């Protein structure tokens, strides 16, 4: 598959730190891309990676590090707050004609 | 392998 | 030594007689080594070298795939540039696309390129710097705007420097 | 981003009805997608269009069929609805790389 993402459910503390895992076997030019969906809506764009500086920017504090020699492109937030609660989607570009996306994965934020 | 799809002019 | 990968790309359209005629040449330093032309039989990237038979059908198939995609590409895009130009639909029309990357004597990246071409005069073109572009008329504009905004010069700039470049050492390999 | 829009956002079908899933955007982009997920989590593919005129099967198109007369109009057809296509149907539109989905159309089947 496209993209891996090993995690279908993960538990943090309000105020911590977020790591999501994404995996790519992609064998041509990897164009990446993270989305997020909240209950009952469509997935937004987070942040994306082409190419230049590895470490990319998102929206709402989001950062996303490509890494080659991993294939992977991992998700970031330093602290995350009780609305991050969603499901993420790991992306990866089919030949630049459409997306393939990850299974995704749960985040459930425990409030103080 | 060939260049991805291009973007719309 | 240095060396060249380059794809050539066009469609001409035929007014009121079909779909546009789609094809596309790959050049390795300057000599044709792969070719698809809409017009056949059955459409589909073909070997122009006896060295290039050595990759399996997988490679031929998925090299196939874009080739259909491009196709549409073109069929979409020259009507938009009838759009821009303000011209009939009853006229015949070109669209062009050249690509590829030259690699210095240490295996590296040289220059690439990206550019377009409508009805034998320059449309756009991707910089030497590959991260600005050059657009030749107002109409070509419209595209720059667009392109700066949309991150165009990164995504091509992936694979110009990395796919290509793999592949050309690939395809000298081969021959 | 919020310009893409479908309609209708929540149908209750009956089991071999025809329904048509209606998608409009205004970000004059060339390519529109039709995506489907089930478990709240994968989407898959279903069709997509490059432009105008043209209609492209996905990874499972069986018993649908697609319709983009122009570039902002790209309906989903169910020729006769089944069970099995209950499901979130999201459109998607993009000018090259990203795609921008709309909120998404709850599809449930009756069978009666």
Known sequence: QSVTQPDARVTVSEGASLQLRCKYSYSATPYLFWYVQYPRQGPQLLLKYYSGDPVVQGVNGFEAEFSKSNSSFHLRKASVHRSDSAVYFCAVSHQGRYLTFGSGTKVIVLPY | ?9 | ?175 | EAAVTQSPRNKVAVTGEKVTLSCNQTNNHNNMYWYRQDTGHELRLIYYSYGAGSTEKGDIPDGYKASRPSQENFSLTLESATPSQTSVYFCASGGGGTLYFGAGTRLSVLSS
């Not at chain 3, 044709?32 to 070997?47: K, L, M």
């Not at chain 3, 130009?85 to 990246?109: K, P």
């Open chain 2, 1 to 9: 392998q060939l260049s991805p799809f291009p973007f719309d002019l």
């Open chain 3, 1 to 175: 030594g240095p060396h060249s990968m380059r794809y050539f790309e066009t469609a001409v359209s035929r007014r009121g007689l079909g779909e546009p005629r789609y094809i596309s040449v790959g050049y390795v330093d300057d000599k044709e080594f792969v070719r698809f032309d809409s017009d056949a039989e059955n459409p589909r990237y073909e070997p122009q070298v006896p060295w290039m038979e050595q990759e399996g059908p997988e490679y031929w198939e998925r090299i196939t795939q874009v080739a259909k995609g491009q196709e549409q590409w073109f069929r979409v895009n020259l009507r938009t540039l009838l759009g821009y130009y303000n011209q009939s639909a009853g006229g015949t029309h070109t669209l062009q696309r050249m690509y590829g990357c030259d690699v210095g004597s240490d295996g590296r990246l040289l220059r690439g390129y990206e550019q377009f071409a409508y009805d034998g005069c320059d449309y756009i073109a991707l910089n030497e710097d590959l991260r600005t572009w050059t657009a030749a008329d107002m109409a070509a504009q419209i595209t720059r705007r667009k392109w700066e905004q949309a991150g165009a010069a990164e995504y091509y700039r992936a694979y110009l420097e990395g796919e290509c470049v793999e592949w050309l050492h690939r395809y000298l390999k081969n021959g």
